[PDB]
Write a protein that binds this ligand. Structure first.
Ligand SMILES: Cc1ccc(C(N)=O)cc1
Ligand SMILES: [Cl-]
Ligand SMILES: [Cl-]
Ligand SMILES: [Cl-]
Ligand SMILES: [Cl-]
Ligand SMILES: [Mg+2]
Length: 348
């Protein structure tokens, strides 16, 4: 057991191992209560997040366990991973606080997409790294569900990692109106048309790639219905085959009220873009999710010729999420969380 010391931070007393020095607040609270620190063991600048009294309800106790399982699983260059996890508690009986230690990624895609001139070669490398990460994530049967520029960390060398695992489900208020949180969502999840799957994440990659090429949001809707109209104007109204797959009868009736529209010509929308980037955008932004390109197929597309290495695009160990369908008491979720904390083995 390491030696711990105390100091006053973000309105509570933090108790952390001596290895973590020069703690000070960072971010706007998007990902929780977070300080930056210097890690004397690895030499990295790190983010330390404190979950205080997080076994306060069944929902919160299950969420805590979920975030710890997902972060412990993810071991990939283009994905956020767990450097360390700790509690100052000496036993289960006094266990109350969880601290997570992850790589400190200062800038996101939002802080360079607007304030910088991105060449075609920049767009190739950034989207390449998102798809390499996604291939890994999807091989574990994990769906991200929230890919957007603020969830992508980028350094001065244009190296990228994907964030946002096992946090609270976004609320109905968070998805209302003129908001970035909805602009990247696949239409089948934004309107609950059907049971969604990992294909929702490829729609999000399409919206991100378009924005890097044009400097503008692809579908900046003022509400769910305004956004749907922007989508259908680009990709066309649904045909008979997709309409059959929309389970909600009410959603199907609404769709059939709209005047039919053809798919637009993407070379006249993305004027001047690499024709290989136009072709890839057409394969991601397909309304029928069954027909979208997969992350694994997209990595082999000609647009990524100068980056693609099929011997360096790894897949994930299998990820058991049977806990997702399990009903437990607060103290049971808390005990499983304590076991995951004490069993943690750090990376090389
Ligand atoms: C600093 C930090 C950032 C992201 C996450 C996460 N659960 O995705 C955790 C911690
Ligand atoms: Cl220490
Ligand atoms: Cl504690
Ligand atoms: Cl964003
Ligand atoms: Cl597992
Ligand atoms: Mg999110």
């Amino acid at each position: 057991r390491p030696t711990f010391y105390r100091q006053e931070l973000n309105k509570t007393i933090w108790e952390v191992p001596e290895r973590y020095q020069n703690l000070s607040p960072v971010g706007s609270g998007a990902y929780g209560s977070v300080c930056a620190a210097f890690d004397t063991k690895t030499g990295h600048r790190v983010a330390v997040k404190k979950l205080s009294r997080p076994f306060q309800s069944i929902i919160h106790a299950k969420r805590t366990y979920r975030e710890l399982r997902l972060l412990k699983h993810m071991k990939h260059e283009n994905v956020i991973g767990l450097l360390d996890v700790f509690t100052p508690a000496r036993s289960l009986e006094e266990f109350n606080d969880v601290y997570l230690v992850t790589h400190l990624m200062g800038a996101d895609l939002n802080n360079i997409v607007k304030c910088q001139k991105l060449t075609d070669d920049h767009v190739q490398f950034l989207i390449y790294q998102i798809l390499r990460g996604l291939k890994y994530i999807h091989s574990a049967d994990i769906i991200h569900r929230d890919l957007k520029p603020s969830n992508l960390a980028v350094n001065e060398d244009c190296e990228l990692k994907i964030l946002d695992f096992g946090l609270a489900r976004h609320t109905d208020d968070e998805m209302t109106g003129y908001v970035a949180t909805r602009w990247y969502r696949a239409p089948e999840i934004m309107l609950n048309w059907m049971h969604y799957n990992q294909t929702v994440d490829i729609w999000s990659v399409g919206c991100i790639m378009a924005e890097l090429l044009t400097g503008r949001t692809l579908f900046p809707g003022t509400d769910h219905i305004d956004q749907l109209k922007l989508i259908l104007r680009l990709v066309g109204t649904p045909g008979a085959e997709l309409l059959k797959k929309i389970s909600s009868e009410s959603a199907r009736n609404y769709i059939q009220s709209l005047a039919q529209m053809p798919k637009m010509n993407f070379a006249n929308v993305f004027i001047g873009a690499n024709p290989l980037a136009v072709d890839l955008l057409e394969k991601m932004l397909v309304l029928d999710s069954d027909k979208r390109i997969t992350a694994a197929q997209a990595l082999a597309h000609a647009y990524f010729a100068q980056y693609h290495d099929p011997d360096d695009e790894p897949v994930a160990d299998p990820y058991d999420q049977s806990f997702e369908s399990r009903d437990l008491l607060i103290d049971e979720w808390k005990s499983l969380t304590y076991d995951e904390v004490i069993s943690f083995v750090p990376p090389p």
